[PDB]
C-alpha cells in the first residue's frame, strides 16, 4: 500500500492535519495506512478512522441521492428520453460508494474486529460494520439485497448484545449504536415500530442513568439522547 513506508505515528499525525484541512479522502487514506500497520487502535484512533470514512461516504451518499432522484424523474410518464448518461453516472458514483464500503468492511474483517476484546472497541467496530452494510443496503436492488440487510442486522445485533451486557445505558457508544440501529429498522428493514420502540427504550433508560454522570459525561450522553428524541419526533 502507498502508506506502507510511512510511520504509524506520522500517519496518525497527518490524519489529524487532514481533518483540520477538510481533506477527508486524505484522512481516510492515512487512517487506512495506520490500520494496516497491524496494531490495535486506541479510542482516539478509532474515532479518527470513523470520522474520515464517514465524511468520504457521506459525500458519495449525498451525490448518489441527487443522481438517483434525477434518474427516477427521468423514468416518469412524459419525461423526454435523455439517453444512458444519468444511469451511467449514478452507477459510477454507486460503484465508488460500494468500493469505499468494501474497503471499510475489509479493514474491520482484516483484522480489527477479531483483535477487539474490550467492549468499547468491539462494540465500536461492530456498529461500524452495521453502518457500512447499511450504506450498501441503501443502494442495493439485486439478488443480494436481503443478504446485505441481514449482514447489517447481524452486526448491529451482536454490538447491541455486548453493549447491553457491558456498558451503562448512558455510554455514548451504546447510545449511538442504538440510534443507528433504530435508523436501520426505520429506513432499511421496513420496521418503523421496532425503530420507535428501540429509540424510546434507549432514551428512557439513559435518562434514568444520567444522575450517575459528571457534568462532562452528562453533556456527551444528552447530546445523543436529543438525536433519539429528534428521530422520535419525526417518526411519531
Amino acid at each position: 500500500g502507498a502508506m506502507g513506508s510511512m510511520e504509524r505515528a506520522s500517519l496518525i499525525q497527518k490524519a489529524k492535519l487532514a481533518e483540520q484541512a477538510e481533506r477527508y479522502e486524505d484522512m481516510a487514506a492515512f487512517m487506512k495506512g495506520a490500520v494496516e500497520k497491524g496494531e490495535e487502535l486506541s479510542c482516539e484512533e478509532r474515532n479518527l478512522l470513523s470520522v474520515a470514512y464517514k465524511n468520504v461516504v457521506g459525500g458519495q451518499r449525498a451525490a448518489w441521492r441527487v443522481l438517483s432522484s434525477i434518474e427516477q424523474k427521468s423514468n416518469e410518464e412524459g419525461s423526454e428520453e435523455k439517453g444512458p448518461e444519468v444511469r451511467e453516472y449514478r452507477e459510477k458514483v454507486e460503484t465508488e460508494l460500494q468500493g469505499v464500503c468494501d474497503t471499510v468492511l475489509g479493514l474491520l474483517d482484516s483484522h480489527l474486529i477479531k483483535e477487539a476484546g474490550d467492549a468499547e472497541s468491539r462494540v465500536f467496530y461492530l456498529k461500524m460494520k452495521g453502518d457500512y452494510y447499511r450504506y450498501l443496503a441503501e443502494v442495493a436492488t439485486g439478488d443480494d439485497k436481503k443478504r446485505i440487510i441481514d449482514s447489517a442486522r447481524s452486526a448491529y445485533q451482536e454490538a447491541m448484545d455486548i453493549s447491553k451486557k457491558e456498558m451503562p445505558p448512558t455510554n455514548p457508544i451504546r447510545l449511538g449504536l442504538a440510534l443507528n440501529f433504530s435508523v436501520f429498522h426505520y429506513e432499511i428493514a421496513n420496521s418503523p415500530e421496532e425503530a420507535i420502540s428501540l429509540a424510546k427504550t434507549t432514551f428512557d433508560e439513559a435518562m434514568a442513568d444520567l444522575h450517575t454522570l459528571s457534568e462532562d459525561s452528562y453533556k456527551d450522553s444528552t447530546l445523543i439522547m436529543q438525536l433519539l428524541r429528534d428521530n422520535l419526533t419525526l417518526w411519531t
Binding site: 474515532n47 470520522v51 457521506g58 449511538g176 435508523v183 425503530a195 429528534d230
Partner: peptide, 9 residues
C-alpha cells in the same frame, strides 16, 4: 431521520 453525524473528531 438521522444517524450519528460522526463527521467531526
Amino acid at each position: 431521520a438521522g444517524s450519528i453525524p460522526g463527521r467531526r473528531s
